[PDB]
């Protein structure tokens, strides 16, 4: 009985789809907020702003953080929906991204978005700090980090690796609070306005201006971190933007 | 013609002189039931019965029409039975000269005899039991036929007698036997021999094939694999040269020919040589006053394949043409496994013995170690000249994978074809028994 089969499949399909369609469309707003707060929790943590709970995170992120878009080729602020910007998706499309040469691709990233989002920390109407997202290939997976740079444009205030897949203990030690805390106070550039942050194998000399101890037994992952900063602090990354930051 | 390189000639001390002499008089003879594969006897005699030379002693329930006849005339003095009433031997005390006669023909008529006529005479006289089928090494069914009858006119078994010496004394009977086999076979007769010369049949059906190499170069299984590969649908028959002489004698004189030449040899045999005896001859009486003092093991057949000739089994096997005597190797040695083997023979080169080439060894029955799981170091491939993967096949037998063993060539094998594999096994597996377990499973399920 084809009529019987059509009635059950149609009726079952309609009722089941209605629940599915209602569930997905209705809960979409809640899903969007949940995804966002994860990034906001990291940005607040590197910014030095202590937050706890979704309500506190959302309230404090808006009050203290002002996401903005920046053009790498010029290092100048641009206008767009920064709060809803997905730099990763942009980097995958040639319209809003470029392909790096083998020599240029120090961080080993295949593509770099033409415009990337940055986050400014403001106690009041003044920007006390800027957070720059930097990523680079590790030994096992792409590693994404947040770097809090002070108004000077040279000193680094905070570091955090919020997405990585290196081996715990050896390469996953980028998450270790002691190792991250060592970056505070270091200078990204030297007197000649050139990248100067160096990951020192075996441990940087105490009091080093640009010396962060490498990950013990994890040279390959430590090499990736060095390549990340050697690129993103360079001309094709945030170098031009930090030059503007140094002068305002 | 066909040269064999993969194999092993065991250099055991006490090789025979290869001169035919007269052995000790034999007053006791027996037929051994367990020697015939898959044979369930139907007894036709009782203890105290008088029998003639070629009178039937028992019949096979699972092979109707095959008659196992006496080798000698005399009295039945015992019927030894083992576990589950398994017939071990039917011992007959030799007395008298009565015999059952048969038709006799001139040598020029044997090739022209009708096939059914030949089968009847061979079956009635009991000489039909000389044939063994490959696969399964059983006596052929009365109604069956074979396109290939293999005559083993060579012996590469250690301490074996030279067939040429024996065949030369009975040239006419051997040629007469080949003519009978020419008419018996539906196809051809394969005379597998060494390079030396032997009497030849003028029939186009009889083809001479030369096999050179170590053991197993003189094994019927080896010859079949190279000339007529066998399967479930390609069955060959095997017969040794001395049985061929018996076949020729039967069709020339009309009488069962039971005289045989067997090599009495071994490290503990004072005068290793060829001796004339009778079928099923008592080995205890045959070796009397010929062995060194001590605990010795008398073996019907070769040390590689053969039956321990003790108690009810102390008689010459139907298919055995040699008697080997060895010392029992029960001595325990301190770190014996760790010594340089000047006097130790091995397929490997891990002992000093292999350096002293040409040396002979007083091998005993010692296992030279405990039982262990197979650790294949390539010993099996070194002694196996057939187109098979022995290690994989031996693993199938160990696991009892009957179907896999069939695919790998188990149906082509008899126990003796695996004797060298058993000899060289570091784990001390005994693959002949495992093969029989697999073959029995295939026959029953098939």
């Amino acid at each position: 009985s084809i009529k019987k089969t059509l009635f059950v499949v149609i009726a079952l399909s309609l009722v089941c789809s209605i629940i599915v369609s209602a569930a997905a469309v209705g809960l979409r707003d809640k899903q969007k907020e949940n995804a966002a707060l994860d990034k906001q929790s990291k940005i607040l943590q590197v910014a030095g702003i202590e937050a706890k709970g979704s309500k506190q995170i959302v309230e404090l992120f808006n009050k203290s953080i002002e996401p903005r878009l920046v053009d790498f080729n010029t290092g100048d602020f641009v206008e767009g929906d920064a709060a809803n910007y997905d730099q990763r998706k942009a980097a995958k499309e040639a319209s809003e991204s470029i392909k790096l040469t083998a020599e240029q691709d120090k961080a080993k990233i295949q593509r770099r978005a033409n415009v990337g989002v940055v986050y400014l920390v403001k106690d009041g109407d003044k920007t006390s700090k800027v957070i720059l997202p930097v990523h680079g290939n590790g030994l096992w997976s792409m590693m994404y980090a947040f770097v809090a740079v002070e108004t000077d444009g040279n000193t680094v205030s905070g570091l955090t690796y919020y997405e990585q897949g290196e081996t715990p203990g050896l390469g996953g030690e980028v998450e270790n609070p002691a190792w991250r805390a060592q970056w505070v106070g270091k200078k990204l550039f030297d007197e000649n306005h050139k990248p100067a942050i160096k990951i020192v194998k075996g441990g940087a000399p105490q009091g080093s201006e640009h010396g962060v101890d490498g990950l013990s037994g994890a040279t390959l992952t430590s090499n990736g971190v060095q390549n990340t900063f050697d690129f993103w602090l360079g001309d094709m990354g945030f170098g031009p933007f930090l030059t503007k930051v140094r002068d305002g | 013609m066909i040269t064999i390189k993969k194999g092993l000639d065991l250099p055991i001390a006490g090789t025979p002189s290869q001169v035919i002499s007269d052995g000790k008089a034999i007053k006791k003879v027996a037929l051994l039931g367990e020697e015939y594969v898959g044979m369930r006897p139907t007894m036709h005699v009782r203890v105290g019965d008088e029998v003639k030379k070629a009178q039937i002693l028992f019949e096979d329930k699972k092979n109707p029409g095959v008659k196992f006849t006496s080798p000698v005339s005399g009295k039945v003095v015992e019927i030894n039975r083992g576990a589950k009433r398994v017939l071990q031997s039917v011992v007959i005390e030799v007395a008298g000269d009565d015999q059952v006669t048969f038709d006799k023909f001139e040598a020029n008529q044997l090739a022209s005899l009708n096939r059914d006529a030949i089968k009847t005479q061979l079956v009635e006289s009991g000489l039909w039991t000389a044939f063994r089928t490959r696969p399964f090494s059983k006596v052929p069914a009365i109604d069956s036929t074979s396109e290939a009858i293999f005559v083993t006119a060579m012996d590469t078994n250690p301490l074996a007698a030279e067939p040429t010496v024996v065949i030369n004394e009975q040239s006419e009977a051997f040629v007469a036997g080949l003519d009978v086999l020419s008419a018996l076979t539906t196809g051809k007769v394969y005379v597998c021999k060494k390079g030396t010369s032997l009497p030849r049949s003028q029939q186009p059906n009889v083809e001479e094939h030369v096999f050179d190499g170590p053991h197993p170069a003189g094994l019927a299984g080896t010859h079949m694999h190279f000339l007529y590969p066998v399967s479930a649908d390609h069955v060959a028959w095997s017969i040794n040269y001395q049985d061929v002489i018996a076949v020729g004698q039967l069709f020339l004189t009309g009488e069962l020919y039971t005289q045989r030449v067997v090599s009495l040899a071994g490290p503990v045999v004072n005068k290793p040589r060829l001796v004339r005896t009778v079928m099923g001859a008592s080995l205890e009486q045959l070796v009397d006053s010929e062995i060194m003092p001590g605990e010795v093991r008398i073996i019907s057949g070769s040390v590689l394949s053969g039956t321990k000739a003790t108690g009810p089994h102390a008689y010459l096997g139907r298919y055995h043409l040699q008697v080997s005597v060895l010392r029992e190797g029960r001595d325990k040695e301190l770190f014996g496994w760790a010594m340089p083997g000047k006097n130790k023979f091995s397929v490997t080169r891990s002992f000093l013995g292999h350096l002293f080439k040409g040396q002979v060894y007083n091998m005993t029955t010692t296992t030279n170690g405990s039982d262990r799981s197979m650790v294949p170091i390539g010993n099996y491939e070194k002694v196996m000249p057939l187109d098979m993967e022995p290690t994989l096949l031996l693993r199938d037998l160990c696991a009892g994978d009957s179907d896999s063993a069939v695919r790998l060539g188990a149906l082509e094998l008899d126990e003796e074809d695996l004797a060298l594999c058993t000899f060289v096994c570091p784990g001390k597996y005994e693959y002949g028994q495992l093969l029989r377990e697999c073959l029995d499973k295939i026959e029953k399920e098939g």
Partner: protein, 195 residues
């Protein structure tokens, strides 16, 4: 070119069976015999090589966000679309084999019912959506994943057949030892993990 790395990635570097754990129920079940295991691997390849590219077009033409209309994204209709499409192609392929390719039906069609709604096919399609793969990349990936899956099952069948000589304690015999065997196999396949 780019394709060879993708084909290599889906066979060795990425192993659908031993790394992503997909299709273990059938992978750990029909592994006993090499001949049967080889047939399933071929059947899995056929389904994978057809399932993934077909779903890739459906995803990019219907389910892709802002594709049919601007502002509407039917991403939630992902599992139902793939599972239904996969079920149809597997079911459709089996019937035609029994009607036009008798010999292929026994060799391949016999295993197709098992491949219906199998974790191996669904997971591969899901990864093809978790990423951005062109149609050419979808076919190369789909073919590569199946072949790599066939490598693991065929390898596990060789070990299990070799294990006929093993003496496994009761309790481990069968499923228990097989899980240990699969775990050991995954150990040796991690050589390409860093590649």
């Amino acid at each position: 070119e780019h394709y060879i790395s993708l084909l290599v990635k889906s066979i060795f570097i990425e192993n659908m069976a031993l790394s992503f754990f997909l299709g273990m129920c059938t992978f750990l079940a029909v592994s006993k015999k090499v001949k049967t295991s080889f047939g399933l691997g071929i059947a899995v390849i056929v389904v994978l090589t057809i399932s993934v590219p077909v779903n890739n077009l459906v995803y990019n033409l219907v389910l892709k966000p802002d594709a049919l209309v601007e502002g509407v994204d039917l991403s939630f209709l992902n599992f139902i679309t793939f599972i239904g499409v996969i079920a149809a192609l597997v079911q459709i392929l089996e019937m035609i084999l029994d009607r036009f390719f008798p010999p292929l039906y026994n060799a391949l069609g016999i295993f197709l019912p098992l491949i219906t709604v199998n974790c191996a096919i669904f997971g591969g399609v899901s990864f093809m959506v978790q990423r951005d793969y062109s149609f050419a990349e979808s076919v190369v990936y789909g073919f590569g994943s199946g072949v790599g899956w066939m490598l693991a099952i065929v390898a596990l069948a060789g070990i299990r057949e070799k294990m006929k000589y093993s003496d496994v304690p009761p309790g481990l015999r069968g499923l228990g030892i097989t899980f240990i065997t699969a775990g050991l196999m995954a150990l040796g396949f991690m050589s390409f993990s860093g590649v």
